[PDB]
């Protein structure tokens with residue numbers, strides 16, 4: 424994710440410690456939010 | 469020029485504008501707040 428001049432950007436790739444082979448990422452959404460953001464948290468199930 | 473919806477007898481002070489901000493305002497960034505500007509080194513919270 425990023426928020427350069429707004430325009431919230433989300434990318435995602437699902438590949439069926441950490442894998443070493445290269446992986447790409449495809450944008451699904453691109454929405455111009457244009458707000459001030461400072462902190463991040465993740466929800467759970 | 470709009471002196472119709474923004475003028476009437478006895479005056480209208482409804483609108484507002486900011487002069488005291490802790491720093492410069494970044495483009496396209498709203499800084500809505502009612503926070504008293506600090507002068508000197510006092511943590512005064514209020515008017516006066």
Ligand SMILES: *[C@@H]1O[C@H](CO)[C@@H](O)[C@H](O)[C@H]1NC(C)=O
Pocket residue numbers: 459460461491492493494495497498499
């Ligand atoms: C956005 O947030 C930062 C960190 O609080 C602040 O420095 C900045 O002035 C804010 N944007 C504005 C009000 O232009």
